[PDB]
């Protein structure tokens, strides 16, 4: 069964769970008055999830989750995106600055107190009922100036079913966030295109981290003074293996699903977000990939590994659409909540189905800009976000080291992607819509915007301190860079404002949609959406029949790496040690009973994106993995769970201690680990 | 599962763990020296396919792709039978095939001493002749005497086999009216044409059907309006009972080729040039030639032989070497030539080590030779038609002013325009990328001083590949039908000597010749030591327990209807059905596109008697026999002898099963015999051939 469930409705769904082989209480994994799992699950740099595992604060959270953190403190010398990294000690653990890990300390539900501060907003905009931002901006109101006011604080107030409810999470966020270990990419990151969002899967994708704090166990900005946080509850690791048919149970932070989506909904978010993108990113693919399939990666491994992870869901979801009659479930369920109202005398629900088709139907040709716009060129085209002037000198010095900085390159994708990215976008939308001329004056969409790297001073870094004597303010104000990028950026800004005419009645009609899907059915019974706030899901160790013929066991084994080994081929290179490992069967304490070494499972858990780094526990709350991945078929999942084809992809917690221990020797973690055997 | 290709004398050796596996027959029903047995009923199919008989009125069974050839010349865009398939309601509706012939084994004799006395009478050898067909046959005339060597409708096979070592005989029936009855849709005939191939899981309705005919009195005959149907003495009874995990599968038919007593030496020479170089090579034709094919209609049914067959030994050349490096293929047969080194050794044996390093010693002596003409004959022989341009004869150099021999000349050259520029030839995929990819990349790899004379002189003179190929295109008589006829009307001696395309053919035909004689140097004494290696192995091992390789000649293999374990996490089961086309269907990639009524009968659940009895419909299914290139065609049957299935492609993991049987991995991949009925009577509504074809439940 899917759904995300609420902390506050594991008392609804322990029975069921302790029927499935679960052997804890309800207070065991979500306790509103003490120490409970939901203490040790833990949010990872805004969008991942991770999990305490010991008395001094160590963080087990995904290898792709804490990839820009390793990159960073990577040169040719200490590799350590290629070779891994260890500590052997605490003082040898690498600062992270930027870097927050937030842990929920009380969750409380809010839903009357917001209501009573969102009534009469002088002149109700489109969509402040459902905005973060206004909302944990009301925190204030709710519990005075000890919000935001308390440094180590961040109180979390967001809407639940549509905006029928409010729950409020209070964090600690704490700012010193330290690299205890990472192992080499080709482990961490094995197939990581073929692969990716695949069952079978042969992947190490795990970091770890510490969470440090000040001397009283506060969380703190950064200081060398700073000690081991010390957590009220982590989670034990159990190392003594898994077997199919066993309970698993996974906490974490959901991101974005769309489990309310009516029919007319299904259809636009595919044949618009969903194909729009699929050959935007399907062009923005091919032009990047045969650059540098020519040319030596690390300038564009990172552009090309975002675009693929995101269009492959995107396919998968197209397949989920087109072969799980995606629409049609969706259609019924509404139609079961017309007739239910209909039955009641209620006008209300057919009346919020009318105007979410109305809102669809009207906002399909803006729509179609806002997203062809913010993939065709917004993140597409890496400087249209170059500085501006305020001179009106002190920061666009300060800002120009934000645009061309460790990562940027103005060196090239120059019109093998610059151009491309331009496309023939401007011929599905006209140029009559496009932002603030330049492509009926150079020509083309690549004689415009390559005449840029000349002309603007933005190009180079050594131009920009070339003439950094005087101000050719004539100049600065009007280089066409700058211009391009306040230019795609106006239009952004307009079709927000307008297409919000639309936004705003479909988020009145929805709210009012769910609220007869909340009183149909019971509300402690009926999960809501993800909204990057913490949750749990629970199934069992199961792998699944693809298609005919074919059956897909539970678990992976080391072998599988060593059949997928290709030197030839970047993403299936294995170590040397690792095969060497392999070749001996070295594998002690960690192999299954049946002498194979274990590396990743499935399970039948609900999980979207923003669960990568998930503790994955047994029925006694122990670890026994981490979750990093979805199937492609059950990309559909955050419209449908697809019980017959949807499986989180999870690595084994016996691959990630063997990898510590085994493969880099660093027994100091094992003895902080302490696994159970 | 036990690898072997047993010859049918071998069938004694088999026959009581056949048993033990379930088999219920008797050796002398599978092959009977002494009266009629199954072999009777396995026909070999257009020189390179096997094909079974299921009537008393000749009707036979073989694959689609087997029958593509003839589908294909049937074929125009108004009657396109590779598209739409083909179905005959009477004999008279069934199609006429010249040159196709079908042959029957009547009767197999060991003729190795014959044969060696023969060799012996060789005053200086090259070396050659000992496994040279051409040399072969020519002695079949003194072995069975000159009457009966000219009886009409026989012909006398002579056969090497255990690398020398041995020689049969084969007594065939040879039949030259063979008809077209019935072929499905290639939508179904070839479901996942491209993709599939080489591959389980398989739902391909891989099936054509065919009639022999024969005289007056029941002979084998050449085409006459005046044949009737053959009766055969014997045929396979159909069961359509349907097939389940465990059941004993027995398979006869001709396996083409095997190397199953490959050196370590071997198999590297074999995956380094000859599969790499046919990878490569066929990798740029089939990129263009497809390219082609899906923008013309007409274009798809000219190529469509030549591109599926091209597609076909470039998929499998990439399974072998896939196969060799996943599968440890190499290290196998060292291991096991070490095992009869060890053996040799220990009886005081010094030819076997001799044998060895003879071999490697060959293999490394003729490699640039062998590069070259791999390159020669995938870049150049194969795919680029120009090489059978017309070329004018000696009577045209000098003896024009000869009216006869001139007019002969003349009549030559229009022999071979007509050969060249054939219905299937189409001079603008020639010329407009497709010949030029093909020869820029084989300049590119063969140094100029080691190309034809023709291709080295004129890429000097033009700039390039193109430039040259753009030149002949454009000076050569033979560019166009037209011009062709336009300049015979009044011929010129000149030019017609000249002739560029002409010379590139020559050139061409010249080393190609060249490079057979100077790399006999090397073939000779890597067969001679071949041969004496064989002869080490089957002291070894005795013959009666070894199986030779194939080498298209009537052999048996035997297993069960079993999957298998392709990789971690995966587990593949023995039989798929209608379901898994209809997850594969796809309307804009044309090789997944599903034919509405088939798609009508899935969603009606429509299949009579033929489904599972799960209510599934049977498609394909997969069983541990050993099978090869050959055994296309090949009647599958059950413990009874009745026919379950036809055999037609070998799974991924078992492409390297020509090197080693690996009884993990290989299975070959069948044609459920219950799907065929399917197509034939919902599908197609054939009622007549499911009356002959008389299934039984
Ligand atoms: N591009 C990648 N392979 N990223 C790592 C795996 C991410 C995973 N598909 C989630 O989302
Ligand atoms: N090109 C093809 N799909 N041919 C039909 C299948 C032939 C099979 N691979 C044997 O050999
Ligand atoms: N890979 C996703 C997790 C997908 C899932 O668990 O469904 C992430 O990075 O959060
Ligand atoms: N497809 C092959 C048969 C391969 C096999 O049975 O191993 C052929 O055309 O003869
Ligand atoms: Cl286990
Ligand atoms: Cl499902």
Redesign the interface.
Known sequence: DGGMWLMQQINGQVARMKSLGMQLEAADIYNPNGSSLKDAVVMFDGGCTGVLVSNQGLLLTNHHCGYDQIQKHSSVQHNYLKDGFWSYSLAEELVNPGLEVEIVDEITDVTAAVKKELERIKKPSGLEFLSPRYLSSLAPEIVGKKAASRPGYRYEIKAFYGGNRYYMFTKKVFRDVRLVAAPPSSIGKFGSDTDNWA??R?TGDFSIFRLYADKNGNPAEYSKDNVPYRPKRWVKVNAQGVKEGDFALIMGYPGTTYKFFTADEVTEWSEIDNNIRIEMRGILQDVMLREMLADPNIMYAAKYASSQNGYKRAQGANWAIR?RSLREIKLAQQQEVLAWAKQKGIATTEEAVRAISKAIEGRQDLRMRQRYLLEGILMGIEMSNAPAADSDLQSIRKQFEAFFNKDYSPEVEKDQLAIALLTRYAERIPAEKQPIEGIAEYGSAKAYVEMIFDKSIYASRERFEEFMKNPDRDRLLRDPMSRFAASVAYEHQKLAKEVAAFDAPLAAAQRSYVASVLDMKGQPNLAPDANLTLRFTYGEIK?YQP???????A???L??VM?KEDPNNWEYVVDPKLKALYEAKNYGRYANSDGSMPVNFCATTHTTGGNAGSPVMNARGELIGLNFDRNWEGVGGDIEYLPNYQRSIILDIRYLLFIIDKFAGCQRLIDEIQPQF
């Open positions: 069952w079978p042969h072969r792998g298609r005919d013929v074919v059956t897909y066991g678990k992976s084994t072998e599988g059949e």
